[PDB]
Amino acid sequence: ILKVARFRVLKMRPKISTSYRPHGKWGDFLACIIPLIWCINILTNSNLIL
Amino acid sequence: VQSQHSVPASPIRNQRHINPVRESGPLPSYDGTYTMEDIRAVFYNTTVGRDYC
Amino acid sequence: YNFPEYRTGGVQANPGITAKRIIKCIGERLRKYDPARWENVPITFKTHFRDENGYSDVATSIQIHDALEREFGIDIKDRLALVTDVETAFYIVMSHHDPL
Amino acid sequence: MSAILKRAAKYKRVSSILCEGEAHLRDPFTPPPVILKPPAPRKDKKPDDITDFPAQKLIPLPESIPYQEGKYRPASIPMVAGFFPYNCYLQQGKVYSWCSCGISQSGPWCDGLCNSVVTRCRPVVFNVSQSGYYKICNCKFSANAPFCNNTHRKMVRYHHQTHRGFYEIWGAALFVLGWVYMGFNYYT
Amino acid sequence: VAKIETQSLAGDRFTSWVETYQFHPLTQDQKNFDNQDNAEFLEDEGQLKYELGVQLDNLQEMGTTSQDIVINFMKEGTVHHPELFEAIVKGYNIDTSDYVINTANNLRAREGNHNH
Ligand SMILES: CCCCCCCCCCCCCCCCCC(=O)OC[C@H](COP(=O)([O-])OCC(O)COP(=O)([O-])OC[C@@H](COC(=O)CCCCCCCCCCCCCCCCC)OC(=O)CCCCCCCCCCCCCCCCC)OC(=O)CCCCCCCCCCCCCCCCC
Ligand SMILES: CCCCCCCCCCCCCCCCCC(=O)OC[C@H](COP(=O)([O-])OCC(O)COP(=O)([O-])OC[C@@H](COC(=O)CCCCCCCCCCCCCCCCC)OC(=O)CCCCCCCCCCCCCCCCC)OC(=O)CCCCCCCCCCCCCCCCC
Ligand SMILES: CCCCCCCCCCCCCCCCCC(=O)OC[C@H](COP(=O)([O-])OCC[N+](C)(C)C)OC(=O)CCCCCCCCCCCCCCCCC
Ligand SMILES: CCCCCCCCCCCCCCCCCC(=O)OC[C@H](COP(=O)([O-])OCC[N+](C)(C)C)OC(=O)CCCCCCCCCCCCCCCCC
Ligand SMILES: CCCCCCCCCCCCCCCCCC(=O)OC[C@H](COP(=O)(O)OCCN)OC(=O)CCCCCCCCCCCCCCCCC
Ligand code: FES
Ligand code: FES
């Protein structure tokens, strides 16, 4: 947030985005660890109470 | 009909690239008056302000 | 001791030598693979490895691919092209950017 | 300007060469420096006139460069693909195109992204007379490129020496120490 | 035109171009403007007697113009072409008719340095 608000505006330091298309292949899998941990914690607590 | 078949017909369009050439200018040189290093040294200095330079 | 040449594209610069090497390796591989069919058959530039009707033998083509790759120290892309004749073998070898 | 002219007599000039040194003593493709004398100024400057300055030799970008026997200096600054080398088994007599720019998607070997990225670092085409395992450089700063020469350790040391790199490294260090301390104090 | 290149502690590099007439040197105490004509900030050989402060009337940094920007040249820094440096500091326009071009591609883009 700080970086975007301080430097990414046209006035300060715009960047020439030359990338045409995305190429991510497993970033979704890497990111889903955190929601995976959330689901694991929810399941554990719920089952322990049940 | 005789005259039409006694001479070649008008050509039909073809979409094959024959000796294609760079759309832009020559590739920047390794060394010279202006090199690819000069281009590479421009990304880090990029600003669009409300006043001229 | 013979010093190797400094220039890289020797095979490209000498089409005849590359063709002779291709013919030699293909002939050796064919004689080792199917002797009964190629022992008495000389291999030249115009020779092709298809049947009388034009159908190709995948086994023979892949054997030729392996022979060429071993000879020239390159990797032939089988899925993209098939070496059904010496002309195609020469075309692929010359297309490859690092043959030796 | 009287004071400046008076002091110019005792003013002395210093060389304009700094830590980067001279590129022609470390890059075979960099010609030795040459001084060009501008011609006399034009008395009449036509609106559609062209430069009369003497021409400078133009050296195009080579497709690939040979193996520098321990005297390799990249033309540009390459991307640091990795901080430790690749232990790759090379075949005898097989030509390999080691990646210099450092963005190749095929590993240590050139993938073609050099032609798509703005850089003067060209792939190094080399051959090996004895098959076996070699440590191929990944930081792309090795003087013995394409072969690793432990320059990645010095690159890591310089990153740690830098003010911001030190902060990043030790911030990650203390972040992990957070887990370590939580484990140590788990029982209370 | 004078191009000034500076760097921050985070490695960010800022290069800004300023017209020569916008410079104004300060005294050794930094509390007043030193006389542009008779300014004593260069040693006899050419180096800086003391860390020289100069105020730029208008500086365009990152495409933004600011007023009265003070900058410093540390005494612990080599000075090349003392005459040109003094002229730039005092705000004179340098006549470059007698010029030669040296072709030396010794500097790469984003070149590393010890200023980190
Ligand atoms: C309470 C605490 C109090 C502390 C107080 C203060 C103490 C002060 C201490 C000061 C000194 C600290 C020094 C810290 C160094 C940090 C910097 C650093 O190392 O980076 C430089 C490093 C330079 O690297 P390098 O030294 O040049 O080596 C490059 C070589 O390519 C690397 O390749 P290689 O040549 O090394 O090859 C490795 C291996 C390659 O083979 C393998 O694939 C490895 C596994 C082989 C099988 C081993 C079986 C045993 C179980 C292994 C389990 C893990 C294996 C995982 C494999 C995954 C494969 C996908 O070789 C083989 O082919 C197999 C050999 C097996 C022989 C068996 C020997 C006996 C058993 C031990 C085996 C260990 C093997 C290495 C494991 C490495 C991690 C995976 O810079 C980088 O590039 C950084 C990369 C990222 C680093 C991340 C990790 C940072 C931390 C590392 C240090 C760990 C210290 C932990 C101490 C804990 C104490 C509580
Ligand atoms: C009846 C039988 C039943 C059997 C059941 C199955 C057995 C049990 C499960 C086994 C699971 C195996 C999983 C790994 C698959 C390996 C695939 C493979 O062989 O690839 C071929 C691959 C390519 O072969 P190649 O093309 O012929 O090249 C050969 C060259 O030698 C290649 O040399 P190079 O120099 O080019 O590269 C080698 C190495 C050289 O560079 C490195 O070493 C890379 C990383 C370090 C760089 C800096 C070096 C300086 C020292 C760093 C110290 C780091 C300490 C901190 C480590 C992390 C925190 C613990 O770099 C790497 O391998 C890159 C890996 C980077 C990520 C490492 C992260 C490891 C996370 C797990 C740590 C677990 C620690 C447990 C400790 C327990 C005791 C306290 O070669 C290798 O990977 C060589 C190693 C062979 C595999 C060794 C596996 C050892 C056991 C791993 C266990 C992992 C944990 C358990 C997971 C599953 C159960 C929960
Ligand atoms: C290890 C750190 C986290 C520790 C705490 C959490 C426990 C460990 C979680 C491990 C997460 C591993 C996957 C995400 C990270 C990326 C790793 C990777 O390579 O992933 C791609 C891999 C391979 O997927 P892939 O091959 O499709 O990857 C992309 C492929 N390309 C690039 C070709 C497009 O994913 C997996 O292997 C996931 C399945 C694992 C094995 C099967 C069991 C799990 C099945 C789904 C579970 C659903 C939720 C469970 C909730 C709990 C139930 C009790
Ligand atoms: C009863 C009363 C008891 C009182 C006890 C008081 C105890 C006081 C203990 C002081 C410990 C000081 C540790 C730091 C020492 C640094 C030395 C030095 O200059 O090294 C330079 C050297 C030189 O490194 P270098 O040259 O490679 O690169 C860095 C160089 N600079 C910084 C100049 C850019 O650094 C090192 O090699 C690393 C040394 C260890 C660094 C540890 C960093 C800790 C960061 C803490 C951040 C804030 C949180 C603190 C609390 C939590 C800590 C887990
Ligand atoms: C290298 C030079 C400097 C050091 C030289 C050697 C030591 C010199 C003398 C130091 C004197 C001051 C500290 C003396 C100890 C104070 C009492 C103490 O630490 O008790 C633990 C206290 C309470 O923790 P509690 O949750 O009750 O118990 C957890 C059990 N797992 O803990 C707390 O309140 C939590 C506070 C954070 C503690 C984190 C580390 C664990 C405690 C280690 C104590 C030993 C000294 C550590 C010194 C580290 C210096 C970097
Ligand atoms: S050299 Fe890295 S992609 Fe060609
Ligand atoms: S990886 Fe570049 S020197 Fe070891």
Tab-separated table of C-alpha atoms in Angstrom, chain A residues 3 7 10-13, chain E residues 12-14 62-64:
chain	number	residue	atom	x	y	z
A	3	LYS	CA	4.768	1.763	-2.180
A	7	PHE	CA	5.777	5.979	-6.073
A	10	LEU	CA	2.152	9.090	-12.810
A	11	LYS	CA	3.736	12.103	-11.116
A	12	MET	CA	6.499	10.221	-9.284
A	13	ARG	CA	7.559	6.979	-10.981
E	12	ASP	CA	16.954	3.843	-5.351
E	13	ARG	CA	18.848	5.988	-7.865
E	14	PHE	CA	17.551	9.435	-8.846
E	62	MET	CA	10.815	12.310	-10.162
E	63	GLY	CA	8.890	14.584	-12.503
E	64	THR	CA	7.943	16.933	-9.648
